[PDB]
UniProtKB/TrEMBL annotation, chain B:
One of its GO terms (molecular function) is mRNA binding. The lineage of its organism: Eukaryota, Discoba, Euglenozoa, Kinetoplastea, Metakinetoplastina. Residues 1-71, 82-153 form the RRM domain. Transmembrane segments: none annotated. GO terms for cellular component: cytoplasm; nucleus. Keywords: RNA-binding. It comes from Leishmania donovani. It comes from the Eukaryota. This is RNA binding protein, putative.
Amino acid sequence: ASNRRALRQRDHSKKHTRKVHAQRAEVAAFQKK
Amino acid sequence: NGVYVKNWGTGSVADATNVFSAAGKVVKVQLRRQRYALVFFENSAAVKKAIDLFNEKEVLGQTVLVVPAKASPKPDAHENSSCVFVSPIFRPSTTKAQVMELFAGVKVQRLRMYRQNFAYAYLDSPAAAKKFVEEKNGTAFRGHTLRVALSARSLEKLRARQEVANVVIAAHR
RNA sequence: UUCUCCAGUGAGACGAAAACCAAUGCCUUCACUGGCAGUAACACCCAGCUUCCUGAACGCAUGUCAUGCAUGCCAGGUUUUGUUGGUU
């Protein structure tokens, strides 16, 4: 169960440090644009 | 990476203990920095293994916290923004106005989850003596034992995250 | 044809994108108020039984009712709309 949380944490940390951030950069452009 | 060990003693022969400890399972020592040992003592960081390092060692002569960071004890445990959680409460057996003002209170007051229970009192009181009195082995609200203790969450933090969240929502579109 | 509550998909004790509807989550207000930022599941008592360019410590950040003493440190090289059911 501890191993299964460790993979939950991991797989969704890498959704934050990729998929969230790069999208945020795009959307944060439109405010100034 | 491995184990930042803090406690004996003061007062230590930290260096002597570390030198002896080399040998497996353990390797890489040195006595450092704020308090009083780091030994690596691989590999999951903090570490899983370190539980053992409690009674193992002393001799000598107390001992032990370990951490990987942050690691003043003050932020995570002691205080922090004087957040509380109130437990048990139940969503269809309460109203938002009911538990709110009965516990000071609050604001901000957001019950979870449903599960059920574990409802942030984002509080003000500040929180010091409030825990001691509403935990109590009582007083019974609404019929359950009522256990109230500390967080270790919030305040302005969540508010800042709401601000960046708000501009992201308006921007997307 | 048990009694304890708050408005009926009620609970507690005891005996590869996106949006329309209802429920339900999370965020926000005060208020189901406005709305998808967040993200295994759960109606307590067991919260997990080398190409090309951007860039550089045992503590920072995520997370803290945690034996979470747990993860995180490279961009290039029929799903989505928060979630399930219904509709388009």
